[PDB]
Amino acid sequence: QEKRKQISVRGLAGVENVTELKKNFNRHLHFTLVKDRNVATPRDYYFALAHTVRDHLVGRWIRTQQHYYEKDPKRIYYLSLEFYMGRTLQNTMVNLALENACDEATYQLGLDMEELEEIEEDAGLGNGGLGRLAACFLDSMATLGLAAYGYGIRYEFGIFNQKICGGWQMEEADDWLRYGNPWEKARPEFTLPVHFYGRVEHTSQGAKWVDTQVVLAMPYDTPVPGYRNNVVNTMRLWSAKAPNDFGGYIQAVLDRNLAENISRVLYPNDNFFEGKELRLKQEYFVVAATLQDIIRRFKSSKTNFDAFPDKVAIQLNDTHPSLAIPELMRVLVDLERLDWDKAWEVTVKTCAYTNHTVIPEALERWPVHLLETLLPRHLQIIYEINQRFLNRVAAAFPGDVDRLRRMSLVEEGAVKRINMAHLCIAGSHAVNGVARIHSEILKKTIFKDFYELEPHKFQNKTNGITPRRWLVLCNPGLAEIIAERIGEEYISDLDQLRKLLSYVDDEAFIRDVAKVKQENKLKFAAYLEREYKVHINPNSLFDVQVKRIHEYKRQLLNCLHVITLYNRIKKEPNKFVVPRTVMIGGKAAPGYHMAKMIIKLITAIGDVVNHDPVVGDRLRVIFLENYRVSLAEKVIPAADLSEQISTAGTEASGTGNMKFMLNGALTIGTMDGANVEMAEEAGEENFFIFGMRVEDVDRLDQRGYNAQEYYDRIPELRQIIEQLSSGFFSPKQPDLFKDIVNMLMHHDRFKVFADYEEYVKCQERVSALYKNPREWTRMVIRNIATSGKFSSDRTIAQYAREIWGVEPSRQRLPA
Amino acid sequence: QEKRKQISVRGLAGVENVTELKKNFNRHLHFTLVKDRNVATPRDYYFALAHTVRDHLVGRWIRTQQHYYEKDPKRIYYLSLEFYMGRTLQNTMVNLALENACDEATYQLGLDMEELEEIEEDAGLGNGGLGRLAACFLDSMATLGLAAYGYGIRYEFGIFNQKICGGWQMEEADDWLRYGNPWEKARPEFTLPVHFYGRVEHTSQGAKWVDTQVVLAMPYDTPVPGYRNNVVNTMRLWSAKAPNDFGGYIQAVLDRNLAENISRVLYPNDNFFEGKELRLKQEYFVVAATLQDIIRRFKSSKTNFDAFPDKVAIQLNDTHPSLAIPELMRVLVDLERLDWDKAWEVTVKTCAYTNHTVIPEALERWPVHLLETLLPRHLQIIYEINQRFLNRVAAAFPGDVDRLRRMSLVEEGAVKRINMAHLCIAGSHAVNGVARIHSEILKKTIFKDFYELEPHKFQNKTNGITPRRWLVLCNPGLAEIIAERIGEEYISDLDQLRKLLSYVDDEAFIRDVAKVKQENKLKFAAYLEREYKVHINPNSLFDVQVKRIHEYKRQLLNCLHVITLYNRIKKEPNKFVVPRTVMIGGKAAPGYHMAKMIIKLITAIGDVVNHDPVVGDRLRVIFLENYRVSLAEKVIPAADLSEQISTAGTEASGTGNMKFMLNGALTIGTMDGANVEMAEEAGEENFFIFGMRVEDVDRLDQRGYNAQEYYDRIPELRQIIEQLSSGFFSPKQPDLFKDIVNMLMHHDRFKVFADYEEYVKCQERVSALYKNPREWTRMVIRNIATSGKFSSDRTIAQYAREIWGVEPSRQRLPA
Ligand SMILES: O=C(O[C@@H]1Cc2c(O)cc(O)cc2O[C@@H]1c1cc(O)c(O)c(O)c1)c1cc(O)c(O)c(O)c1
Ligand SMILES: O=C(O[C@@H]1Cc2c(O)cc(O)cc2O[C@@H]1c1cc(O)c(O)c(O)c1)c1cc(O)c(O)c(O)c1
Ligand SMILES: OC[C@H]1O[C@H](O)[C@H](O)[C@@H](O)[C@@H]1O
Ligand SMILES: OC[C@H]1O[C@H](O)[C@H](O)[C@@H](O)[C@@H]1O
C-alpha cells in the first residue's frame, strides 16, 4: 500500500538510504543466500531484507559495548529462564528509523515488505507474561541508555506451536531455528564450563567441588536496539554443548545429546512449578555461565570485591535463577577465598528478586535430595545461609519459634524441600511485586514475616509494556493520528498521551480513533478468512480474551457469559442485541487436563453457536489458534473489549490488559493486579469493573465457598450447567464436560459462579455503550490518553533509581 | 615470508585485487564476525579471510549450475558415505588463482596467511583411501567440466580425533563444526522425506509402502571449484532432521534426537564391515534423499524414463549406497508405475559399481531380518531381482546348480544375508576395480562367476590423486621448480611431467629437487618441535608409513625392520649406518584390538630406541598422532622413503603411494595394487620392489603358512620375537605383546615373516642409495617425471568415456 509509506512516525525514505538498502538487499540475495531472482522465494526475500537491516545494528552494537567499557557504568544483569521476544525485523526498523526506507526499497524491488514480515518465526522463548516482561524490559533498558545484559537459555524449541484438531489442543515442536536466526551472533570462542553432580571435599584452604560432570555453555548474542538513541544492548542466550573429551565409541558420541538436552526445550508451564531435574539443570546452567561472565567483566574494569555491588546488579526474574545467590557465595568463598560474611554482604547488595504470583502451586520448592545429588556444594551453602538468616530472625523476634519454622529456607515434610522464594528474600537487598495490589498482598500474606524482619526490602514495581512493539509496530495508524496532534516525543515519554484528553470533544480525533479501530478490525477479519477460511462479522463488537489457559484467569467465566448470550437469543429471538465476535485464545500446558478441557469447551460452544441459523451473524465464538507475540500484535489492535476477569487477588499484574488499553479497547475486569491502577489512571467511570474485591473473596473463604448456592438462586446459571452436564455441547459424548461441571460445583478455587451475575450485568453495560459509537469512542480516548503509566520505560526507570542505583538517560550516542 | 610471494604458480597479486581483498576482509571482520582489531583473534582473521575467499566462488557457482540447466548435459551423481575433503581455504585460493593476492592482502594487514590456514578444521568426513578418492574425484570432475554432483552425509562428527596417551590410541569426537563451516550453504527449503520401517500393502495399482517413520534429509551444498576454468560444481551432504509432527511432551521433543542420530557420526571402519542397523539407516538415508533429487532434476529437463540413463549416471562408491539399485526400482515401479522390465533396463544402464577390496570381512552382507524390518519393500525388490538374475544364470549355464548358489544375492546360513556386492553387479552396467592387478583378481577370484556371465561389465579404473591438493597446494616449492622448466599446463595435464626426464643430468634441477626436499624436511622438523616438543634429526632419511592401521598393510613388518636396525646398531655400535627418522601414523578403528596393540608397540619401540644413548640421533621412531588429510599435506612432501608394504593381493590400489611418488620420495613396496603400475611407469630399476608376488602368496596358501619355519631359520627374527615375548619392549608388563606374538606365530593371515628377509635386504639397498645424494636425487627425478598417470584427471577421464558416456572438457566458462 502507498498509504502506509505516508506514515510520518515510520521515518524518511532518504533517496541515498533507499539506493543503499536495495544494493545491500541484492548483495545479500547473491552472496548470503546464493540465489538469483529466477529461483528466489518470498522466504529468500525476507532473509535478504533481514540481513540488510541487521547490518545497520553492527556499528552501534560495537560502539555501545565499547562505550560501556570506556565509561564503566554499573552493569545490570537481567537473569530469566524466559525471553518472549517475538519477531525482530519490524522492531529493528522502528528503533533505527528505517521502516519507510525499507518499505520504499522493497516496493521499488517489486516486493511487499508486510508480506515479507509474515515469514519471520517468533523467538517464542517464553510462556506468557513473565517472558514478555523480560522482552519489554530489554527494550526499555536500551531506550533508557542502561548498560543492561539479558541472560537466558537459547532453547532449540520455544513454547510449543498449538494446533486445534477435533476442537482439542495438539502440541508440535516450535522449530523456530529451522531456517536459521539472522539476528543472533554465535560466540563459540566465549564458551564456558558448567559443573553438575560431583561431591564436596573440605580441605586446607576450605571446600572444593570435585568429580563433577561438565556441560559447556556456548553464548549466542542478540542485539537489543534502543529507540533512535544509537544504543544497541545485548541479549546473551546460552546453548548446551558436550565437553570436548569423554556402549562403545559410537554410543559415546550419540550420548553427547544428554548434556545438550539441557537447552533443548522450554518447560511450557505458566504459573505452575514442575520439579523436573532437567528444569533444575536449565536453572543452574543459566546462573553458573552468567555469573562467570559477570565475575570476568568485573575483574576487567577500573581481587577486591567491596566495589562489586557498585559495579553489578543481578535482577532475578522469579525464583527461576535463585541459584545465583548460592552460586555467587560459592564463587566468592570457594574460588576467590573471601570470608563468608564479606561474600554475604556483597551477594545481598548485588541481588534483587521479582515475584510474579501468590498461587502456592506456582512457587519453586526443590527436594533437598535432588539438590544434594545435582549441586551438593549449593545445598551446603543454602543450609549455612538458612542458619545465619534464622539466627537473625531469632535475635529480632526472641522466642518466636513458629516464625523460625515459617521463615526457614527449609520446608519440613515427607519430602524436605528448599523454598526458593525464601532463599531469594534472604539473599536479596530488594524484593518487588509487579502491581500495587500484588506488592501489598506479598507484605500482608505470603511474605508478611519477611516484611516484618526487613520492611525496607519490600518494593512495588508496577509492570509495563514497550510502546514501540505495542503501539508504533503493531498499530502504526493509531501511533500516526496521535503524532499528528502531539508530535513523536510520546514514543519514549508515554505520559504525554495525557495531552489527548484535550481531544475528547474533537470531532476529527473522534472520527480518526474510530476509523483506525475499523481498519484494524477489517485487516484482522481478512486474516481469519485468508489463513483459516474463518468468516467473522466486521460490524460486530470484537470481545477478546487472549492469555494462557488457567483456572485463575477464568476463561470458564467467559464461557458461561457466551452461553448466557446464546440462551437469551434463543429465548427472545426477535430482541435486538449488539452483535459480538467472542475470541478466546491461549495455550494450555501439555499436562494441564482442566486447561485442555476448557479449550475443548470453547470450540464445543462454537460448534453449536456458530451453526445455529436463529443466531447467524449476531454471535460467533472463535478459538484463536497458537496465541503468541506475533498474533498478539494482530488481534489486540483489532479488539473492542479486553477481557481481564481473574479472581480478585490471583493475577499479580497482567500486561495484556495494558496492551489492550494502549490500542483502543475498553476493559471489562475485576479489581485485580494492574487493572486497579489502570482504572485509577483513567477513572473508574471509563472501565467496566465488576465482581468481588480481594476483601470479598476472603469473606467467602472465611465462611466457605458453596457453588450450589449460586446454582440454586440463579435460573440462567442452572440452565447452562444442565446444558454442560446433559451433553447439549457434546451430543456424541454427553458426559464429555463432567470434569468441568464437577470442578465448578464442588472444587472451584476461583469462585467462577460468585462473579457470574455481576459479570453478565457488566457485559450488558458494555453492549449499551457500544450502541452509542460516539460515546464508546470518547471513552476509548479517555483510556488511550491515560495509558502512559503502563510504559515499561516508567517501570525500568523505577527499577534503575529504586533498586539498581543507576540514573536512566534518553540521550543518544553518536553516528 | 616474502620468498613464497615470488612463487609464479600461485598467480598474480593484482593491485586492485589486493585492494578489494583487504576491503572485503575488513568488511567481513566488522559485519560478519562483529569484531574490531582490538579483540580479533587469529581465528577471527582466518574466518574473515575464508568468507572473503568464499565470496569469489558465488558468481561462478550460480553460473555453472545455470550453464548445466541451459546445456542439459548428462548428469553424474557420485554417491559415497565418505567425502574426505580436508581443508578448503588454500584449495579455493589455488583453483581461483587468488593465492598470491590473498597472501599480499593479509601481509599488508599485518597477518601471516600460512598461520591463518592452520586454524581451519579438516572436513574429515571419511576413513582413508575410499573417502579421499571421492574428494580427489570431485576436484577432477570439476576440472574436467563434468556436470557432476557428490552426494553423501553431513556427519556432525567426522573421523575421530586420535590422541596418544600412555602410548595408546584414545578417541575424541571430531567436533569439526564447533566454529561453523564458512564454505557450506544450508538448503532447508530443499529438505526431503526419507521413510523407515512400515509394511507393504499390495493393492489395485500394485505395491504401496505404508505406516513408515519419516526422517527429513536437509541438504547442505558445498562448492567444488575446477582448476582455473570458472567451473564450480556441488557437493550435497544430507543432515538428519526430525519430522515437524510427532513419556510426555518434553520426552517427545528430546526423542527427536533418535532420528537426528542418523547423520551424527561417521562409522570409523576402514576395510571392515560392521552390520550396525544405524549404519544401514545412514546408507538408506543418502540413497533415498539423493534419488529424489535425481528424479526431480530429470523431470525438470528438456513421465517417460527411456531417456533417464542418457541423462543420469549413478556411480556407487563401494556397496555403501548399493540400496540405490532397489530404491530406483521402487521409485520407477511403485511410484512412476513403469513395468518391472523397463524399470530394470533403466536401473542397470544408470548404475555402476566400484569395488575397493577383496578382503571378505570388508564386504557388506546384511541380515535379511534387518532389511525385512527396516526396508520391507527393498527386501521384496531384492528377492525379485535375485530370481530374474538367477533365471539368466540358469539359461546361460544350464544345470550349473553350484554357480546359482555362488552367484545368488541371498547367502544361506545360520543368518540368511544379502550380498550387496552381488546386488551391485546384477544392478550395474559397469563394475570396476581400482588398479590393474585388483581388477584382474576380481575377474579371477571373487567375481569370476559374474565375469563369465557378463564379461563386458568388468572394467579397470586405476586410482589417482589431484595434482592441485597433492602438489600445488602441499608442495609449492616443487610445483615451482617444475613450472620454471615446463610451464604450468602440467597442473591439469600431469603426463607433461615426462618432460622432466630431460633433466636427469641437469645440475640446476638436481640441486633444486634436493633443495625443495630439504626445505620440506626442515619445516616438518620445526612442526614436530613447535606443536609436540618432539626433536628429529633433519640430516636423517625420513622413512614414512602413513595409512590406517591394518594387519594387511603390515605396520608390524615395518616394526620388525625398525627393531632389526636397533639390534644391528647394538651388536656393531661402531659401524656407520644412514641415520633414519622412522615415522608411522594412522588411526585404528575403535573396536580393532590388534590395530590398537600395533600402535602401542610402535610407541613402545620408540620408548626404548629413542632413549638408548648408544643409538642417539642415528635412529628415531615416532608415531605421528592424528594422521588426517591436513597432516598428509605436511608429512608427504617431507618424506624420503614411502612405505607401501601390503601383502601382495590385499591393497586394491593405494593412493598414499601416488602422493609420495608425486612429492619426491622413493618407494619401498610389494607388487600390490597401483605399486605395480607405478613401477611400470617409472621402471622397476627406480623402485625398491621386494617380497612375495600374488602367485607366491597363493603357493604358501596351497601348502599352508607355517610362521615357525621362518622363526627357526632366521636368527635376527627369532631375537626380535623373543624381545617382544620376554618384555624387552614392556618391562613393567612383560606379557603386554603376547597377542601380537601369538598372531605372528600362529594366526597371521598376512604372512609378515614370509617377507621379512627380502624386506630387510631391500631396506639395505635403500640405505646404500641414500649415501649417494646425487644418485638418490636422479632416481627421485625419474619418479616425479613418471607420476603423471596417477592424476585423478586421467582416472575421471576414463570413468567419463568408458562408463558414464560423457566427454570431458578443460575449456573455461566466462567471467
Ligand atoms: O489479512 C491481512 O493481513 C494479515 C492480518 C494482519 C493483521 O491483522 C495485523 C497486522 O499488523 C498484520 C497482518 O498481516 C497478516 C498478513 C498475512 C500474510 O500471509 C501476508 O502475506 C500479509 O501481507 C499479511 C491483510 C489482508 C489484506 O487484504 C491486506 O491488504 C493486508 O495488507 C493485510
Ligand atoms: O613448523 C612450521 O610449520 C608447520 C609445519 C608445516 C609443514 O611441515 C608443511 C606445511 O605445508 C605447513 C606447515 O605449517 C605448520 C604451521 C603450524 C602453525 O601453528 C603455524 O602457525 C604455521 O604458520 C604453520 C613452520 C616453522 C617455521 O619456522 C616457519 O617459518 C614456517 O613457515 C612454518
Ligand atoms: O510480571 C509479569 C507477569 O508474570 C506472570 O505472568 C503473572 O501471572 C502476570 O500477572 C504478570 O503480569
Ligand atoms: O579405491 C580407493 C581406496 O579404497 C580403499 O581404501 C582401498 O583399501 C585402497 O586400496 C584404495 O586405494
From Swiss-Prot, chains A, B:
AMP binds at residues 36, 69, 296-302. The modification Phosphotyrosine is found at residues 197, 220, 451. The modification N6-(pyridoxal phosphate)lysine is found at residue 659. PROSITE patterns: PHOSPHORYLASE. The record marks 102, 136 as: Involved in the association of subunits. Phosphorylation of Ser-8 converts phosphorylase B (unphosphorylated) to phosphorylase A. GO terms for molecular function: glycogen phosphorylase activity; nucleotide binding; pyridoxal phosphate binding. GO terms for cellular component: skeletal muscle myofibril. Its EC number is 2.4.1.1. GO terms for biological process: glycogen catabolic process. Allosterically regulated through the non-covalent binding of metabolites, being activated by AMP and inhibited by ATP, ADP, and glucose-6-phosphate. The activity is also controlled by post-translational modifications including phosphorylation. Homodimer. Homotetramer; to form the enzymatically active phosphorylase A. Allosteric enzyme that catalyzes the rate-limiting step in glycogen catabolism, the phosphorolytic cleavage of glycogen to produce glucose-1-phosphate, and plays a central role in maintaining cellular and organismal glucose homeostasis. Belongs to the glycogen phosphorylase family. This is Glycogen phosphorylase, muscle form. It comes from Oryctolagus cuniculus (Rabbit).
